[PDB]
Design a protein around this ligand. Structure first.
Ligand code: RLO
Length: 158
């Protein structure tokens, strides 16, 4: 079981860390949502599906930088909503193909009422998401750490 981004950045068997750069929407007004859709960007396969089934959760997600300072939000995992920052581990997604499948994670962020001007600086860390991978085979308990970076600024006008 290994993951790669669209960019090419990989985390191999046994897990690891990666830096992921997302284009964000340049402008977001108060009570509009900012979406960080990582299901278009992070992908994962099972390396031996014939006899092994991989089980993947969002263990932990935390907010940094502009998102920590001037956005409240939720995370969507596999079609359900959870608080962000995350208060618990989610239900598991099954991976049983050698073909890449999205990691089904998106953030729904909305500016707090304080927020104005540049509220996310380009190049800044905005989140760290921990994919936890297990299987029906042995004790493997691997962390795939995704460190999410803004490619661009985000302005909250008013
Ligand atoms: O995705 C399945 C597994 O992939 C690797 C270990 C791989 C096992 C294996 C075992 C016997 C094999 N026999 C013939 C050819 C290949 C073989 C591969 C880890 O990421 C693990 O955490 C994950 O569950």
């Amino acid at each position: 079981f290994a993951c790669k981004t669209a960019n090419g950045t990989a985390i191999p068997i046994g897990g690891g860390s990666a830096n992921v750069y997302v284009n964000l929407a340049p402008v977001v007004n108060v009570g509009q949502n900012l979406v960080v859709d990582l299901s278009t960007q992070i992908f994962c396969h099972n390396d031996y599906p014939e006899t092994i089934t991989d089980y993947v959760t969002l263990q932990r997600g935390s907010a940094y930088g502009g998102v920590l300072s001037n956005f409240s939000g939720t995370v969507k995992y596999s079609g359900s909503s959870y608080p962000f920052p995350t208060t618990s581990e989610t239900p598991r997604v099954v991976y049983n193909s050698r073909t890449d499948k999205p990691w089904p994670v998106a953030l729904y962020l909305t500016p707090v009422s304080s927020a104005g001007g540049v509220a996310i600086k380009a190049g800044s860390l905005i989140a760290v998401l921990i994919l936890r991978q297990t299987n029906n085979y042995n004790s493997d308990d691997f962390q795939f750490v995704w460190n999410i970076y803004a490619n661009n600024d985000v302005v909250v006008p008013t």
